[PDB]
Design a protein around this ligand. Structure first.
Ligand SMILES: CCCCCCCCCCCCCCCCCC(=O)OC[C@H](COP(=O)([O-])OCC(O)COP(=O)([O-])OC[C@@H](COC(=O)CCCCCCCCCCCCCCCCC)OC(=O)CCCCCCCCCCCCCCCCC)OC(=O)CCCCCCCCCCCCCCCCC
Ligand SMILES: COC1=C(OC)C(=O)C(C/C=C(\C)CC/C=C(\C)CC/C=C(\C)CC/C=C(\C)CC/C=C(/C)CC/C=C(\C)CC/C=C(\C)CC/C=C(\C)CC/C=C(\C)CCC=C(C)C)=C(C)C1=O
Ligand SMILES: CCCCCCCCCCCCCCCCCC(=O)OC[C@H](COP(=O)([O-])OCC[N+](C)(C)C)OC(=O)CCCCCCCCCCCCCCCCC
Ligand SMILES: CCCCCCCCCCCCCCCCCC(=O)OC[C@H](COP(=O)([O-])OCC[N+](C)(C)C)OC(=O)CCCCCCCCCCCCCCCCC
Ligand SMILES: CCCCCCCCCCCCCCCCCC(=O)OC[C@H](COP(=O)([O-])OCC[N+](C)(C)C)OC(=O)CCCCCCCCCCCCCCCCC
Ligand SMILES: CCCCCCCCCCCCCCCCCC(=O)OC[C@H](COP(=O)([O-])OCC[N+](C)(C)C)OC(=O)CCCCCCCCCCCCCCCCC
Ligand SMILES: CCCCCCCCCCCCCCCCCC(=O)OC[C@H](COP(=O)(O)OCCN)OC(=O)CCCCCCCCCCCCCCCCC
Ligand SMILES: CCCCCCCCCCCCCCCCCC(=O)OC[C@H](COP(=O)(O)OCCN)OC(=O)CCCCCCCCCCCCCCCCC
Ligand SMILES: CCCCCCCCCCCCCCCCCC(=O)OC[C@H](COP(=O)(O)OCCN)OC(=O)CCCCCCCCCCCCCCCCC
Ligand SMILES: CCCCCCCCCCCCCCCCCC(=O)OC[C@H](COP(=O)(O)OCCN)OC(=O)CCCCCCCCCCCCCCCCC
Ligand SMILES: CCCCCCCCCC(=O)OC[C@H](COP(=O)(O)OCCC(C)C)OC(=O)CCCCCCC
Ligand code: SF4
Lengths: 78, 69, 70, 52, 174, 96, 117, 315, 182, 51, 104
């Protein structure tokens, strides 16, 4: 586990606070992810997964979006 | 057959329910998606309202317009 | 959903397959050989000069019927 | 003001979407002045209604 | 016929190049000049290697020179002249007529092409750029290549020394 | 006649490039472009000489290297004008 | 190469006919005074684009030119390996690439590959 | 030379030009459909039958809208540059390795480098001649981009050539009869994909036509035909480097439909990188193609020099 | 005022067809020019390119036709940054006194044909800031407007209703038949 | 696998070069006979033209 | 923005307008929430963690996003206090200040 630069208080969360590990295993892991594009391949994998999803598009005007009975539109005189 | 051949069977059922290959072509040209669903209603002006809860919310209920337009 | 990407891709697959295969017909209509003679090496060019010297068609081949009986 | 691609002096000019809101709030009732605050900040709205 | 056409085009573009004040007119004129010079150089050698090499060289050079156009003399007026257009058109049509009425065997180059070499030449049957470029990496003249590596390193050291990067960017009235 | 029918043309174009190099122009970069043109015509004449001989065209890249380093020297001199002057006007430089 | 000249002239001819057909079939409306003006994100420019531009990568451009003529001497030795002395070819090739690595790493050490700023 | 050749070379070149142009149109359709499907949304579906004649909608409109006659521009240089951009982007396609003799390009790599250098010349001429500040900034970004990637593109090509021994790309077919070169050259599969996006001015390297840093880049003053030929020139460059990824890294055979399926897949990869990764800065592009890509190219060139001397002694 | 017809009357009527100019025009040249105009309006009502303008809150709704519920790229509609590469400018938001020459310059540099969609109450008639000093009373008095989307935030359904009504306006737009009858 | 592929390509290249080496002597024999015939024709034509 | 359109659908459900709700008023709220909003908001809040996980898998780890964001636009804390900063621009510079906790 990477160490913390500043000790966090109770009820607070510090982002970008973890020191980078200088041991050989973490340096080799980040080096392999550098020269072999590990996070780029992970982002491409997530994107290729969301290609296979169902679209959220609705066929306007045959299909119309959900609404509410309280909806505010054209004024009318009853 | 775990890859979607039953979906091809459903597509062929959609084609036979549409009224033929020419009628399915005409329905796919007019309505940009080809779908099946139970006929709920027919409004005085001649439009037809279908509802199928199998689809995504927002595409459950749709209208097929009057054939004279 | 995702299969609608395949209309619009096969047309790129088919039409870019057009200018090769059509010549694989269009040579055979007029050359008679589906592969016209390559000119990368000097020896192939010299032997093409030899074929075009022997016949007006370099792709028409002189077989053993050219050789006289003796 | 740019020397090449890098900036030397970036000066913002605003008032291009200045609508005279506060002078207009001075002329309305508080109930009528409440829909102004939806149009102060555009993408958080119930926060501005909460503040007013 | 194509060689005499390249002669006429090179003559006309050289007349155009001698008369252009604006650096971009000189750049476009030397673009079409290096295109025509690259084709003409190709006609003389058995292979087409050094035309390609010269085109990479003269497209790597003027790519930098346009940045110096946009940094120094970016604002300068173009002046089209009807006299230069009429002169170039009359000289161009005159040399196309003169090249059409000329015997092209006498005006052809005497330098030997890959097919102008005889059949008995066994060195012509090899790969087309092997024996031409061999002496760059052979024993008598590898040391000239060594000298060129060291010369390019010394050139880069000179460029770094007399373009001080820490003095700032370059423009007009810096 | 033989000197006239062959290789008389790039002498004329080299003379025109030399006259373009020494003409009264406002900027130094036009002289750099005229240098690139006389590199082109020297390449033409050297290429005629190296193609009378059979397999000695390897030298034609060395002339390109020395000419590109000449152009790089001229470009770095054009940078060094900005270190002292604000311009590349040839009238702005010292005549003595 | 004579066929490449003719097909390059034909591609240039076809593209000029395509551009002239785009110009002929274009909608011909009258030219307004401020329609022709440069865009400049909807406001007045205050300066022409012929104003001199600051160059922060002059050293990188001249190093690019030097490295490109260095590229022009690498491209022969694909062919020269099968027809030369192997010892001389390896001494020249490994010494070429190591001298390029010395030059590039030395200018990386000086920081001359960073833009002036 | 036989008369029929010239006729069949002319016919095959013209058929190739027409098929590359219609494939550019359907490549715009493919990008607009899968790039929507990169996100949740759909592609073009309403117009025509199922969005198939949508590039015809895009081509009818751009060939009829009013031609811009800009005020401060040099119009005689502004009109000619997209013509030359499309001319070189279709002229580079004569380098395609045909198994029939289309053209005997013995020096196809040098021809590819020449047309690659000339396409960015048309881009930077069109950027200057518009006389707009965003157009000049996009043009200078394109010049800095090509100065960044040019020597890296050349040395990486040399390493592939070493595995071949000749500059003729049809000799890529004989050396790939047992396997593809994606096994050996996977780090330059990544590096050549990085260079090929910088070649075609595509995301993550899209500084010549920026939609957020600049306003449309150098295309800011081009409309209704000039923009059309610039756009087809860019997409024909995308098709050409997709083809060159299929030639070098994959099978160089052209008599199989799997080659064109692979070319459509590499074009889908070209759309796929744009829909995932954010754009760089061209400062970081110049610091990438000079300190990482060039050093790796020289080092792995040394590796291939040693491997080719090792292989030559064993033969 | 007429209503939608009853289904018996609708069955009595025939199909309208795609062409708004009718099937036949009793002349070969008129029929050829009408079909060329039909092809041109199909190419023009397909893929109108709106302009990245976005003055105010109504713009946030403009990304809800970008957002994958409504998908404006399904219709051919796709945003372009430059006004030269745009058919439509969606004036959507408050048009103030400082944005009068900005909107006039961006509209004038956009090339013909030009159709402007006025989205939102501020762009239509000033709206909730109508009686203020700085707000221009609608965008009609500077630039022409072809489509008036009426909601203050329109629903993205109601914005694509304006976009589809603009497509129907381009479908009824006639220039070659006008040239034959001028 | 590339070493095996290079062995196959070298075998094909050596077979093509062997075919070139076995075809060439007939071609150069025809070349020298036609060369001597054309040299005799050129020497006769130069004597006819320059009289 | 698919999830953002789901929340504007929730806004339209509770107030009747998708964006400008006019809902929170002096003296409470104008209307009670309709029945069944709990299940819809709960289903959305159950899925939104996975949606943020996918968005962070694309954006956060990438080298281009890091090179385009990190060590860029660094503002010191005394400049943040002297120039009257508030919110995230205070919280991004190390200053522990949230108005929801200090003055609730
Ligand atoms: C021994 C042998 C060698 C001897 C050499 C001697 C000759 C040279 C001596 C030069 C001495 C000198 O210094 O002279 C300067 C002196 C002054 O020059 P200037 O012309 O006043 O000023 C020029 C500007 O400064 C120029 O300034 P600028 O840079 O602003 O100008 C912009 C420049 C910008 O120019 C460019 O950008 C270059 C463009 C080149 C290509 C154009 C292609 C067009 C295709 C269609 O434009 C031009 O230069 C105009 C070019 C127009 C196009 C030319 C088309 C034909 C040539 C095509 C070449 C090949 C390319 C084909 C395409 C290839 C595609 C891949 O020059 C002259 O006086 C010219 C000679 C004129 C002689 C008389 C001509 C005939 C009589 C005319 C009048 C007739 C009247 C008839 C009346 C009838 C009714 C009564
Ligand atoms: C918070 O604050 C902010 C605001 O406040 C609230 C704002 O308001 C705004 C402003 C924002 C808005 C107003 C809306 C938000 C903007 C967006 C969501 C825009 C982002 C979306 C995109 C950029 C779309 C996604 C990208 C895609 C899909 C890429 C493709 C896009 C295109 C435009 C490509 C289409 C172009 C084409 C096809 C060119 C046409 C050319 C052709 C078709 C030519 C081809 C030719 C052929 C095929 C045939 C030719 C054949 C020939 C010539 C030969 C044939 C010969 C024969 C003989 C047959 C912002 C930013 C903001 O932050
Ligand atoms: C079916 C296919 C699916 C995948 C398709 C897509 C393929 C993958 C993506 C292709 C390109 C995508 C667009 C371009 C992205 C460019 C990203 C980029 O370069 O970012 C810069 C970043 C910068 O690195 P950084 O992000 O760490 O930055 C910090 C470091 N400084 C600031 C100093 C640079 O990454 C790199 O440059 C990484 C190196 C890239 C080149 C690869 C070198 C390999 C070296 C040889 C390895 C040897 C191993 C050991 C051998 C031992 C032998 C004995
Ligand atoms: C390589 C690809 C190049 C693609 C673009 C080619 C442009 C051709 C322009 C031809 C102009 C011919 C002419 O007469 O020009 C005089 C004209 C004179 O301007 P003018 O405005 O007086 O001309 C108008 C003429 N009448 C009135 C008759 C309509 O100048 C130009 O057109 C400007 C030329 C600019 C050239 C820019 C070259 C850039 C080179 C970059 C690399 C080198 C550094
Ligand atoms: C690959 C495709 C490249 C481009 C091919 C041409 C454009 C696409 C086809 C035409 C347009 C779409 C079809 C259409 O509108 O048909 C309606 C019209 C008929 O509709 P209509 O206009 O008479 O009536 C309206 C429709 N109803 C009755 C439902 C209200 O079709 C035709 O006129 C037939 C044209 C030829 C079709 C040939 C077969 C095509 C099969 C699919 C190919 C994909
Ligand atoms: C895939 C590539 C496709 C490339 C071509 C794409 C479009 C092809 C189909 C549409 C053709 C449209 C041709 C006319 C275009 C200009 C329309 C216009 O405004 O015309 C007004 C002009 C003049 O009419 P006017 O009197 O209205 O013009 C006055 C001026 N304005 C426009 C300001 C009102 O009409 C014509 O010139 C009539 C031409 C008829 C023949 C057209 C060509 C037919 C063959 C093609
Ligand atoms: C014939 C041509 C003309 C003559 C030759 C011209 C070029 C000569 C190039 C080499 C010069 C060597 C002598 C000068 C050394 C100067 C100091 C130096 O560069 O030290 C090496 C240095 C140490 O690494 P550093 O970056 O300082 O790491 C921080 C550690 N505290 O940095 C490094 O280790 C990295 C860079 C080392 C040098 C390049 C690679 C070898
Ligand atoms: C150049 C490109 C030529 C081919 C494409 C144009 C002609 C086909 C076409 O699209 O015609 C228009 C019309 C369909 O109208 P559209 O608005 O596209 O449909 C929306 C519903 N999906 O389709 C029709 O009216 C169909 C009848 C005409 C088809 C002509 C096809 C050849 C031209
Ligand atoms: C490698 C580097 C090479 C460098 C050298 C290249 C040289 C190429 C040749 C150059 C020739 C130049 C000729 C120039 C003539 C026109 C000059 C001009 O400037 O025209 C201006 C005109 C309108 O522009 P203007 O109103 O001046 O607006 C600018 C205001 N700032 O502009 C226009 O109207 C635009 C031009 C329209 C041209 C139309 C021509 C008539 C139609 C021809 C037939 C088309 C047939 C199509 C169908 C064919 C079917 C088979
Ligand atoms: C076979 C392929 C070519 C077919 C061409 C058909 C042209 C006539 C036609 O039917 O056009 C269809 C449409 C206008 O016709 P419309 O009244 O909408 O429908 C007819 C109903 N029976 O027209 C269209 O939708 C576009 C027509 C384009 C015409 C191009 C120019 C032709 C001359
Ligand atoms: C308008 C011209 C634009 C610039 C074209 C540059 C082409 C590459 C540079 C070069 O010299 O290439 C040598 C090559 C030499 O040919 P190759 O060696 O490529 O192929 C042999 C040729 C029939 C075996 C393949 O020539 C060309 O590319 C022809 C250029 C035609 C230009 C026409 C207009 C004058
Ligand atoms: S019309 Fe309504 S939603 Fe649109 S900008 Fe004005 S106040 Fe905002």
């Amino acid at each position: 586990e990477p160490k913390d630069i500043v000790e966090v208080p109770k009820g607070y969360v510090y982002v970008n606070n973890k020191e980078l590990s200088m041991e050989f295993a973490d340096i080799t892991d980040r080096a392999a992810s550098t020269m072999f594009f590990g996070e780029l391949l992970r982002g491409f994998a997530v994107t290729l997964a969301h290609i296979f999803k169902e679209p959220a598009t609705i066929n306007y005007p045959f299909e119309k979006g959900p609404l509410s009975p309280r909806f505010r539109g054209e004024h009318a005189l009853r | 057959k775990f890859l979607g051949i039953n979906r091809l069977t459903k597509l062929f059922q959609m084609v036979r329910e549409a009224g033929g290959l020419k009628q399915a072509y005409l329905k796919l040209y007019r309505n940009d998606d080809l779908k099946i669903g139970t006929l709920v209603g027919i409004d005085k002006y001649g439009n037809k309202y279908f509802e199928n809860p199998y689809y995504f919310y927002g595409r459950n209920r749709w209208i097929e317009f009057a054939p004279h337009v | 959903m995702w299969f609608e990407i395949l209309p619009g891709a096969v047309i790129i697959t088919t039409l870019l397959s057009v200018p090769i295969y059509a010549m694989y017909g269009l040579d055979k209509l007029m050359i008679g050989n589906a592969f016209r003679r390559n000119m990368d090496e000097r020896f192939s060019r010299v032997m093409y000069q030899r074929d075009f010297r022997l016949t007006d068609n370099p792709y028409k081949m002189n077989g053993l019927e050219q050789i006289p009986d003796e | 003001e740019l020397d090449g691609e890098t900036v030397m002096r970036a000066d913002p000019h605003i008032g291009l979407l200045h609508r005279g809101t506060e002078k207009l709030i001075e002329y309305k009732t508080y109930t009528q002045a409440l829909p102004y605050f939806d149009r102060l900040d555009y993408v958080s709205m119930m926060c501005n209604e909460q503040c007013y | 016929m194509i060689q005499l056409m390249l002669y006429s085009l090179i003559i006309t573009t050289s007349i155009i190049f001698l008369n252009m004040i604006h650096p971009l007119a000189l750049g476009l004129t030397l673009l079409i000049q290096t295109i025509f010079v690259c084709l003409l150089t190709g006609l003389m050698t058995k292979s087409f290697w050094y035309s390609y090499i010269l085109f990479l060289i003269f497209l790597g050079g003027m790519l930098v020179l346009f940045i110096y156009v946009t940094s120094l003399a970016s604002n300068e007026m173009f002046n089209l002249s009807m006299k230069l257009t009429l002169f170039s058109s009359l000289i161009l049509i005159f040399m196309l007529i003169l090249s059409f009425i000329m015997d092209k065997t006498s005006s052809s180059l005497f330098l030997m092409n890959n097919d102008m070499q005889s059949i008995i030449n066994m060195n012509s049957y090899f790969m087309e750029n092997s024996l031409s470029l061999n002496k760059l990496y052979n024993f008598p003249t590898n040391f000239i290549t060594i000298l060129l590596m060291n010369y390019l390193l010394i050139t880069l050291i000179v460029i770094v020394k007399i373009t001080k990067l820490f003095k700032g960017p370059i423009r007009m009235m810096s | 006649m033989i000197m006239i029918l062959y290789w008389s043309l790039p002498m004329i174009l080299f003379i025109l490039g030399l006259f373009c190099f020494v003409s009264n122009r406002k900027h130094l970069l036009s002289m750099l472009l005229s240098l690139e043109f006389i590199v082109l015509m020297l390449f033409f004449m050297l290429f005629i000489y190296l193609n009378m001989l059979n397999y000695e065209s390897y030298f034609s890249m060395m002339f390109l290297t020395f000419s590109v380093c000449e152009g790089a020297l001229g470009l770095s001199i054009l940078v060094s004008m900005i270190r002292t002057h604000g311009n590349d006007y040839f009238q702005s430089f010292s005549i003595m | 190469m004579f066929s490449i000249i003719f097909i390059a002239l034909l591609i240039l001819l076809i593209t000029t006919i395509v551009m002239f057909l785009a110009s002929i079939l274009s909608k011909k409306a009258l030219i307004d005074r401020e329609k022709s003006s440069p865009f400049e994100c909807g406001f007045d420019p205050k300066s022409s684009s012929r104003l001199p531009f600051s160059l922060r990568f002059f050293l990188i451009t001249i190093i690019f030119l030097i490295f490109d003529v260095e590229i022009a001497l690498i491209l022969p030795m694909i062919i020269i390996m099968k027809y030369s002395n192997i010892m001389i070819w390896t001494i020249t090739s490994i010494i070429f690439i190591l001298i390029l690595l010395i030059g590039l790493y030395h200018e990386w050490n000086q920081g001359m590959l960073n833009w002036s700023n | 030379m036989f008369y029929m050749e010239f006729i069949l070379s002319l016919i095959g070149s013209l058929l190739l030009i027409i098929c590359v142009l219609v494939s550019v149109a359907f490549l715009t359709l493919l990008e607009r459909k899968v790039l929507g499907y990169i996100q949740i949304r759909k592609g073009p579906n309403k117009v025509g039958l199922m969005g198939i004649p949508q590039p015809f909608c895009d081509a009818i409109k751009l060939f009829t809208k009013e031609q811009t006659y800009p005020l401060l521009s040099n119009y005689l240089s502004y009109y000619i540059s997209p013509i030359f951009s499309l001319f070189l982007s279709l002229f580079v396609w004569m380098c395609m390795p045909f198994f029939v003799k289309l053209y005997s390009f013995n020096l196809g790599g040098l021809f590819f480098l020449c047309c690659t250098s000339l396409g960015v010349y048309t881009v930077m001429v069109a950027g200057w001649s518009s006389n707009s500040n965003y157009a000049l900034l996009g043009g200078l970004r394109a010049v800095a981009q090509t100065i960044s990637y040019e020597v890296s593109l050349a040395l990486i090509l040399l390493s592939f050539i070493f595995l071949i021994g000749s500059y003729n790309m049809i000799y890529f077919f004989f050396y790939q009869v047992y396997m593809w070169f994606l096994i050996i050259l996977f780090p330059m599969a990544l590096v050549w994909v990085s260079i090929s996006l910088a070649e075609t001015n595509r995301t993550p390297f899209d500084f010549a036509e920026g939609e957020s840093e600049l306003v449309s880049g150098f295309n800011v003053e081009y409309s209704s035909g000039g923009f059309a030929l610039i756009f087809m020139a860019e997409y024909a460059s995308i098709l050409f480097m997709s083809m060159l990824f299929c030639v070098i890294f994959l099978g160089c055979d052209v008599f199989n439909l799997l080659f064109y399926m692979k070319l459509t897949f590499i074009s889908f990869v070209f759309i796929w990188v744009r829909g995932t990764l954010p754009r760089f800065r061209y400062d970081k592009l110049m610091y990438l193609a000079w300190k990482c890509f060039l050093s790796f190219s020289l080092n792995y060139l040394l590796f291939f020099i040693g491997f080719k001397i090792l292989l030559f002694s064993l033969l | 005022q007429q209503t939608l017809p009853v289904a018996e009357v609708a069955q009595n009527l025939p199909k309208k067809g795609y062409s708004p100019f009718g099937t036949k025009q009793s002349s070969v040249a008129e029929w050829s020019l009408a079909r060329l105009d039909d092809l041109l309006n199909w190419g023009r009502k397909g893929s109108i390119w709106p302009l990245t303008f976005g003055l105010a809150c109504c713009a946030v709704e403009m990304m809800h036709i970008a957002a994958p519920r409504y998908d404006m790229d399904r219709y051919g509609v796709v945003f372009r940054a430059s006004p030269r590469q745009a058919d439509v400018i969606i004036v959507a938001g408050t048009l103030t006194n400082k944005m009068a020459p900005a909107l006039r310059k961006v509209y004038d540099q956009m090339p013909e044909p030009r159709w402007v969609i006025s989205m939102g109450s501020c762009a239509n008639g000033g709206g909730y800031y109508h009686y203020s000093y700085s707000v221009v009373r609608g965008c009609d008095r500077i630039i022409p407007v072809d489509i008036y989307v009426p909601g203050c935030p329109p629903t993205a359904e109601a914005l694509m209703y304006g976009v589809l009504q603009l497509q129907k306006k381009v479908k009824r737009m006639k220039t070659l038949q006008m040239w034959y009858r001028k | 696998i590339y070493y095996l592929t290079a062995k196959k390509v070298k075998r094909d290249e050596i077979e093509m070069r062997s075919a070139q080496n076995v075809i060439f002597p007939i071609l150069v024999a025809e070349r020298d006979r036609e060369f001597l015939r054309q040299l005799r024709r050129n020497r006769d034509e130069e004597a006819e033209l320059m009289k | 923005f698919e999830e953002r359109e789901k929340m504007m659908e929730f806004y339209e459900r509770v107030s009747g307008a998708r964006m400008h709700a006019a809902y929170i008023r002096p003296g409470g709220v104008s209307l009670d929430m309709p029945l069944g909003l709990m299940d819809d908001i709960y289903e959305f809040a159950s899925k939104f963690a996975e949606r943020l996980d996918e968005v962070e898998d694309v954006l956060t780890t990438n080298r281009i996003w890091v090179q385009r964001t990190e060590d860029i636009g660094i503002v010191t804390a005394e400049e943040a206090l002297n120039y009257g900063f508030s919110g995230v621009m205070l919280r991004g510079s190390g200053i522990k200040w949230d108005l929801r906790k200090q003055q609730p």
